[PDB]
Curated annotation (Swiss-Prot):
<feature type="modified residue" description="Omega-N-methylarginine">
    <location>
        <position position="90"/>
    </location>
</feature>
<comment type="function">
    <text>(Microbial infection) In case of rotavirus A infection, serves as a post-attachment receptor for the virus to facilitate entry into the cell.</text>
</comment>
<feature type="region of interest" description="Substrate-binding domain (SBD)">
    <location>
        <begin position="15"/>
        <end position="130"/>
    </location>
</feature>
<comment type="subunit">
    <text>Component of the CatSper complex. Identified in a IGF2BP1-dependent mRNP granule complex containing untranslated mRNAs. Interacts with CHCHD3, DNAJC7, IRAK1BP1, PPP5C and TSC2. Interacts with TERT; the interaction occurs in the absence of the RNA component, TERC, and dissociates once the TERT complex has formed. Interacts with TRIM5 (via B30.2/SPRY domain). Interacts with METTL21A. Interacts with DNAAF2. Interacts with PRKN. Interacts with FOXP3. Interacts with NOD2; the interaction enhances NOD2 stability. Interacts with DNAJC9 (via J domain).</text>
</comment>
<comment type="similarity">
    <text>Belongs to the heat shock protein 70 family.</text>
</comment>
<feature type="modified residue" description="N6,N6-dimethyllysine; alternate">
    <location>
        <position position="182"/>
    </location>
</feature>
<comment type="function">
    <text>Molecular chaperone implicated in a wide variety of cellular processes, including protection of the proteome from stress, folding and transport of newly synthesized polypeptides, activation of proteolysis of misfolded proteins and the formation and dissociation of protein complexes. Plays a pivotal role in the protein quality control system, ensuring the correct folding of proteins, the re-folding of misfolded proteins and controlling the targeting of proteins for subsequent degradation. This is achieved through cycles of ATP binding, ATP hydrolysis and ADP release, mediated by co-chaperones.</text>
</comment>
<feature type="modified residue" description="N6,N6,N6-trimethyllysine; by METTL21A; alternate">
    <location>
        <position position="182"/>
    </location>
</feature>
<protein>
    <recommendedName>
        <fullName>Heat shock 70 kDa protein 1A</fullName>
    </recommendedName>
</protein>
Amino acid sequence: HMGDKSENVQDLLLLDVAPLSLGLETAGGVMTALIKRNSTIPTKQTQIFTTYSDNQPGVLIQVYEGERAMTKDNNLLGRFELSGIPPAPRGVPQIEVTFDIDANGILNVTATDKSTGKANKITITNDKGRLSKEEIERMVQEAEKYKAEDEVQRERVSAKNALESYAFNMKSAVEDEGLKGKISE
C-alpha cells in the first residue's frame, strides 16, 4: 500500500572548457573577464577588484555571463552585495573575487573583503548558460570585435576593475526580428 518514490536520473553532460568568459562587469558596463574563454573547467581563478562608491562605501559584485564589452546592453548573471564591514573602507584595501567552478555545474563565487577579512559567496547555476544557443555564437564571434572596443572604453570610463555600489541593469526586452529585409542584385 505504501511504496517508495522512484527518483529519476537528473545528471547531464557539460562542457570541458569554458565556451565563454565569466567575470564581473566594471562600472560602465564593460565586461571584466575573471575566467577567460577556452579555459579548462572546472577551474578556480582569483582576481583583484576595487570599488567605487557614491557617498556610502558599498561593494556589489556584478557577475556576468559571456565576453561582452557591452554588458549594459545585456542581462546580468548574478549579483551579491558585501556588507557588515566593521572598519571604515577607504577604498585602499582591494576586494578579492574568486570564481570556483564545480564539476556538478555550479559556479561558486566568493568575494573576500581584504578590509576586514570577511568572505561572502553565492552558488550560481547557469548549466548551459542563460542566453540562447544562437546568441552564444555571437558572444563568441563578436567577442573579438568588442575586444577592440574594450581597451578603448575601458580607459575612457576610467574603470579597469572598479565595482559600483549599485548596478542598475535595465530590463531591456529583446524584440522579435520583424525587420523584413531583402538582398539586391
